[PDB]
Enzyme design. Sequence first.
Site, PDB file in Angstrom:
ATOM      1  N   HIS A 288       0.886  -1.261  -0.044  1.00 32.55           N
ATOM      2  CA  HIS A 288      -0.130   0.105   0.055  1.00 32.55           C
ATOM      3  C   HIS A 288       0.814   1.243   0.014  1.00 32.55           C
ATOM      4  O   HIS A 288       0.513   2.237   0.594  1.00 32.55           O
ATOM      5  CB  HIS A 288      -0.913  -0.173   1.188  1.00 32.55           C
ATOM      6  CG  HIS A 288      -1.810  -1.183   1.301  1.00 32.55           C
ATOM      7  ND1 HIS A 288      -1.645  -2.283   2.064  1.00 32.55           N
ATOM      8  CD2 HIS A 288      -2.907  -1.556   0.561  1.00 32.55           C
ATOM      9  CE1 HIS A 288      -2.561  -3.111   1.868  1.00 32.55           C
ATOM     10  NE2 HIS A 288      -3.193  -2.780   1.138  1.00 32.55           N
ATOM     11  N   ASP A 428      -0.231  -1.349 -11.345  1.00 34.94           N
ATOM     12  CA  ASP A 428      -1.092  -2.666 -12.034  1.00 34.94           C
ATOM     13  C   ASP A 428      -2.123  -2.161 -12.775  1.00 34.94           C
ATOM     14  O   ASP A 428      -2.612  -1.352 -12.820  1.00 34.94           O
ATOM     15  CB  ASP A 428      -1.276  -3.632 -10.972  1.00 34.94           C
ATOM     16  CG  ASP A 428      -2.324  -2.906  -9.840  1.00 34.94           C
ATOM     17  OD1 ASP A 428      -3.102  -3.740  -9.306  1.00 34.94           O
ATOM     18  OD2 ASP A 428      -2.194  -1.722  -9.365  1.00 34.94           O
ATOM     19  N   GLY A 515      -9.503  -8.145  -7.502  1.00 34.96           N
ATOM     20  CA  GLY A 515     -10.887  -7.991  -8.000  1.00 34.96           C
ATOM     21  C   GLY A 515     -11.129  -6.627  -8.230  1.00 34.96           C
ATOM     22  O   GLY A 515     -10.257  -5.916  -8.446  1.00 34.96           O
ATOM     23  N   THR A 516     -12.523  -6.444  -8.894  1.00 34.11           N
ATOM     24  CA  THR A 516     -12.908  -5.444  -9.545  1.00 34.11           C
ATOM     25  C   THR A 516     -13.509  -4.141  -8.604  1.00 34.11           C
ATOM     26  O   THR A 516     -14.195  -4.548  -7.757  1.00 34.11           O
ATOM     27  CB  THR A 516     -14.262  -5.557 -10.594  1.00 34.11           C
ATOM     28  OG1 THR A 516     -14.954  -6.353  -9.911  1.00 34.11           O
ATOM     29  CG2 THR A 516     -13.724  -6.223 -11.697  1.00 34.11           C
TER      30      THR A 516
END
Lengths: 735, 146
Positions: A288, A428, A515-516
Site C-alpha cells: 500500500h 498494475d 478483484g474489480t
Amino acid sequence: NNLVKTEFTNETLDKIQQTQDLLKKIPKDVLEIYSELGGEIYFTDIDLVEHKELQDLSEEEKNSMNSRGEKVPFASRFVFEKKRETPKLIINIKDYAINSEQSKEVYYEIGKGISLDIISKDKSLDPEFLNLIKSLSDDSDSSDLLFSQKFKEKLELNNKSIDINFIKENLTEFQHAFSLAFSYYFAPDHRTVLELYAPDMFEYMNKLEKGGFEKISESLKKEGVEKDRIDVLKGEKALKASGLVPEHADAFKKIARELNTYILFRPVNKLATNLIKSGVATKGLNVHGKSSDWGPVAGYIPFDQDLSKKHGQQLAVEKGNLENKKSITEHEGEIGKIPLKLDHLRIEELKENGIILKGKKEIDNGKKYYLLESNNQVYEFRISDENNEVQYKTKEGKITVLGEKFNWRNIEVMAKNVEGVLKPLTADYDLFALAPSLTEIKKQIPQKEWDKVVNTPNSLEKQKGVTNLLIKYGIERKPDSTKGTLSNWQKQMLDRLNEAVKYTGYTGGDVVNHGTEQDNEEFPEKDNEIFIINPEGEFILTKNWEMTGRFIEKNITGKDYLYYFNRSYNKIAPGNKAYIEWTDPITKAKINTIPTSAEFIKNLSSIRRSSNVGVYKDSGDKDEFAKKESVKKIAGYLSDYYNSANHIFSQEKKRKISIFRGIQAYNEIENVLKSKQIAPEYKNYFQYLKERITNQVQLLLTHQKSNIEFKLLYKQLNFTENETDNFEVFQKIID
Amino acid sequence: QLTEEQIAEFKEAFSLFDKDGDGTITTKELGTVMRSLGQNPTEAELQDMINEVDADGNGTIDFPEFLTMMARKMKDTDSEEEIREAFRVFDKDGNGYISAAELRHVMTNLGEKLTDEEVDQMIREADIDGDGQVNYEEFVQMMTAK
Ligand SMILES: [Ca+2]
Ligand SMILES: [Ca+2]
Ligand SMILES: [Ca+2]
Ligand SMILES: [Mg+2]
C-alpha cells in the site's frame, strides 16, 4: 417518430381518404428519408394562410425560386416547406379536387421534393459522380437535349459543358429540376413525360425508387446513432489516455471477444506503462506504498516515501514508510526492496517527459557516474555506469522533512517475488468492472443443477429457483486469500487476462492482481476516465463519472450483460468516508412506494441514534404510550400492505384492497403527526412517509380509474369509530 | 457480531412490541417482532430459539436473550444484498420495476423458454399490490419468503 400529423379530422373519410391516397402515392422510403431527416408532415384541415401552429415566421420567403415556376403568391398556397434545420411539410385540403388536373398535386410533390433535393443525392452525400455525371446529361451524352421541362432560365446555357466547373453556383436551381423529375416520376398523372422527354432523370428517379431512396434512408439511419451518441474517444486515441500497454490491451481484445464480456480499467499511470512492457512487476494488495511522479524513481514504489508523490507530507510519508515496512515485515520472502536500475530506454523516456535531465559526469571511488538531474530541491541523483543503479543524498545545504540528512545512497524500490526473484514494482491494471454476457454466465452454471431447477412444478418457485442460480453463479462475491474480493468467474477471467498478456511476452508475473473496483466498498475511488474493451474488441474511454454511468446504462445495463455496482455507492464509504453517486433504479421508484414494516422501524432506529430521542420515551406519560401504540399500528398496516396471500385475489382487488391498506397507514400517520410533542426530526420523517403513501396510492388509482385524486378520496372517509362500512364506501367511492 | 446500528434496530423493534413495557417478550410477541423486521420463522421453528433459554416463566426472552439469539440465523447471512442485485438485473430498463416483458427476457438468455402465458403468470403471483409489475419490495418477498 410518427411522420404524419393529421390535425383536424373534420371532413368524413374524405379529407382522410385524401391524405391517405395522397401519401400512399409517395414512396414508403421517401418518407423514411423525410422521417430520418427529422421531418414531419402536416395535413391540417382548412389552414391556408400564415395560420398553422407552424406557419408563423421562422425561415420563410427570403429569395424567390418557389413553385414549378417562380411565382411566390403565398395566400394562394395549400402546400409549404419549412426548409431549414428539420423539414416541415404542411398541406391542407378543402373539398374533393386533386385528381382531374393533378397539375396541382404535383406541387405537393415538388413542394415535397424541395426536402430531399439539397439533402438527397444532389448534395447529402455530395454530388457523387452518380448525380454529377447525371447532370452531364445536359446535352452531351444522350441524343436527348430535352431538358426544358426542368431547365429554362438557369440552363439555356447549353453553351457550357456542365461539370464541376459550374454546377455549384446554382444548387438552388439544380434542385428545382430534381423537384420535377420527382414531381413527375410520382405524380398520379404524368409519369411517362419524364421517361419520354429526359431518358436519364427517369432511370435516375427510377433507380432511386429501385433502392436509391432506401440508400440515403440508411446512410442517415446508421448515422442516426453515430451522430447523436455518447462522446467517447475510441481507438488508440483512447488507448493512449488509457495507460495500458497496447500489446496487452490488444491481448485483452481477444478474451473480451472469446468470453464476450466488457472490460473496464481505471487509469493506469503513464509513468508506468513502459515500466511494464519493460518487465517490471505490478503492485498487489500486499503493498500500500505510494508511487511517485518525478525524478529517476518515478513510476516505481520507492521504499523511501519522501521520494514519492507525497513529497513533504510529514505524515503521508511518516505513516507512508510505515506501510512499506509492514509490507515487508508481514509478507516477507514475497515483498521487499531492491536497488533501482533505470535501464536505457527508460532514461531516454524520462527525458522529454522532463522527469530527469542526464548531464555532466563525475568520478568517485574509481567508478564512473553520469549525473542524473531533477529540479527537486532536497535530493540530488546520479546513476552508475557499471551497473546503471541510481543514487541520491540530502543536499549538503538542506534536510529531509522527517529530519534526516544522508550522503549518496542507493535508491531502493519495492519488489514482490516473481519466480523466486525480487522484481521492482509499478502500477498494475486495476479493473474498474467486468461485464460478462448474461448467456456466458449461463455456461457457468452446471447443466444438472440448472436442470433440476427448471423442472420445478411451481412457477413462482421456478423464478426464485433461477434467480438464486443467477446469484449463486454470477452475482455472488466471496473474499479471498490474495485476489482481494471477487466472484469465481471474475477470477477465471483474471487468469485469462494475465495468461493472455503472458503469451505476449510479459515476464514479471500478472498484471491484474485483485478483484474489480466495484467491490472496493472500503476505499472506493472515483476516476473520471474509464478505459473499456467491449465484447467486439473496440477500445473506448469515457470522460465523466456521468458518461461512464451513461455508457454502462446504454450498453452494459440495458443490453443483457450482468453488471453490479459498488455496494458503497450513494452510501458513505467507511474507509475514506467518501460519497460517490450512481443512478440506482430502485431508489428511483422509492419516491412512490409505500415503506415496509421493517424499512419503517429501521428509519425509527436511525433517528433515535441521531437525536438520542425516540418516537416515544420509556415513561409514564399515557400520551407517550399512545404514540408507541400508534406507531405499532402503522408498523402493522405497512406490514399488511405487503401480504403474500394477495395472490388469491385479482389485479382489480389487489389495487383496491391495497389502496385501502395504504390509506389506513396514511391515517395513523396523520393521526400521530397531530398527537403530543414528537420531535420535529421525526415530524419531518412522518411527513416524508405521507408523500410516499400519497404517491403510492395515487399510482394504484391512476392505474385503474383516473379522476379520483388522493386528497379528495381521503376527505370522504370516516375514521372515527367504525372502519367496517368505510371500506364498502371506498369501493363505491371508486365507480 | 452485529453492528451497533444493527443492534439499535433489533431493540427499536423488540421494544415496540413489548406491550407490558418491561424488557421480555412473549412467544407470539417474538414472532411479531421478527416478522416486522422482515422475517418469519415457522410456527414451530419459533420455539427452538425461545426454548433454548428457559430462565423465565419458561415463556419469554429479555432484550439480550433476543439480541444474542440473532446469530443462529443472522451471523452467517448476507444475501439481502445479492437479491437486490438480482433485481437490478431483471429490471433491464432502470424504471425500478420488473415487467413481465423483461422477466421473460432475462429468463431466456439464462437458457429458459418461458411461455408468454406462464410469465404474465409469475409476474402476477409476485405482484402483491396489483399494479401488474414487481418492485424491489415484492421481489424481496418472493425471493426470501420460502
Ligand atoms: Ca413483556
Ligand atoms: Ca423495468
Ligand atoms: Ca407491483
Ligand atoms: Mg491495484
